[PDB]
């Protein structure tokens, strides 16, 4: 019954092909609700969920200003990190920032986060106390020093423990039919021979929300984790998710294998069997 709001921002330098590409998106749990793309015509923060559309002009003007301000900061950051790492003008680099807050079933604060990455790797992140920083190499220590001198953690903490949770609750209320739902997975297993001595057993979960799910195979009750191909949970495109897990088994042994499904919409975890 637990929820989260997260904003994700990516900027990519493109030396000689314009100013950096900037993309921003916001989510409540697994549902996207807003986006911004610097290469789009509108130059506005735009709705991506029907329940956010009701926010008035002040909201959209305000979110547009903020997201443009984020974009400008990341543009500066790209030049700064080049200097910190002594990198050349010519190559393309990526900065990513994500932040947000988590609340429990009662919608009270659990934790917040605010993290940054340069070229695919941790750079700097607020620690769980929201008062100090973890800096992942020496360039990030420079950033820590400047951010500590500027009292950045204090204003981030006021947002993460206050504003962030307050807007999350508002979204959860306004978007309740979409966001407070739980759709339990529809499960089945398929069987296809891959030769006359081996068969693929694939355990499927379809049409579920939220995205979080566990799929496992057992053989005589022993977990088969090293032998299981597990795909990334994937969007169906309609607001729900899909996932499967497969094992290749000697023909004749099917009845030894069971698939186990855990999801918050199930009243009990499921066990699917071949007998």
């Amino acid at each position: 019954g637990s929820h989260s709001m997260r904003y994700f921002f990516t900027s990519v330098s493109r030396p000689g092909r314009g100013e950096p590409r900037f993309i921003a998106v916001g989510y409540v749990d697994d549902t996207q609700f807003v986006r911004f793309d610097s290469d789009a015509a509108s130059q506005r923060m735009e709705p991506r969920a029907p329940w956010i559309e009701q926010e008035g002009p002040e909201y959209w003007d305000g979110e547009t200003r903020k997201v443009k301000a984020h974009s400008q900061t990341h543009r500066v950051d790209l030049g700064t990190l080049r200097g910190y790492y002594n990198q050349s003008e010519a190559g393309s680099h990526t900065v990513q920032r994500m932040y947000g807050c988590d609340v429990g079933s009662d919608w009270r604060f659990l934790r917040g986060y605010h993290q940054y990455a340069y070229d695919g790797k941790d750079y700097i992140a607020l620690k769980e106390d929201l008062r100090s920083w973890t800096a992942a190499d020496m360039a990030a220590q420079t950033t820590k020093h400047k951010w500590e001198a500027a009292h950045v953690a204090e204003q981030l903490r006021a947002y993460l423990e206050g504003t962030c949770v307050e807007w999350l609750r508002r979204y959860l209320e306004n978007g309740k039919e979409t966001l407070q739902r739980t759709d339990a997975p529809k499960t089945h297993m398929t069987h296809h021979a891959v030769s006359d001595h081996e068969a693929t057993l694939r355990c499927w979960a379809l049409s579920f929300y939220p995205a979080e799910i566990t799929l496992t195979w057992q053989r005589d009750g022993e977990d088969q984790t090293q032998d299981t191909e597990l795909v990334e949970t994937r969007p169906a495109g309609d607001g729900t998710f899909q996932k499967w897990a497969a094992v290749v088994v000697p023909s004749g042994q099917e009845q030894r294998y069971t698939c186990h499904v855990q999801h918050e919409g199930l009243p009990k975890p499921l066990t699917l069997r071949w007998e």
């Binding site: 904003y7 921003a24 916001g26 909201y59 305000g62 979110e63 903020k66 997201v67 301000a69 984020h70 900061t73 500066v76 950051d77 700064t80 990190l81 910190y84 920032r97 932040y99 605010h114 940054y116 750079y123 700097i124 950033t143 400047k146 951010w147 500027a150 950045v152 204003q155 981030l156 947002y159 504003t163 962030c164 807007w167």
Partner: peptide
């Protein structure tokens, strides 16, 4: 609603 007071590195 997104944050404010985000600084450059």
């Amino acid at each position: 609603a997104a944050g404010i007071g985000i600084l450059t590195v």
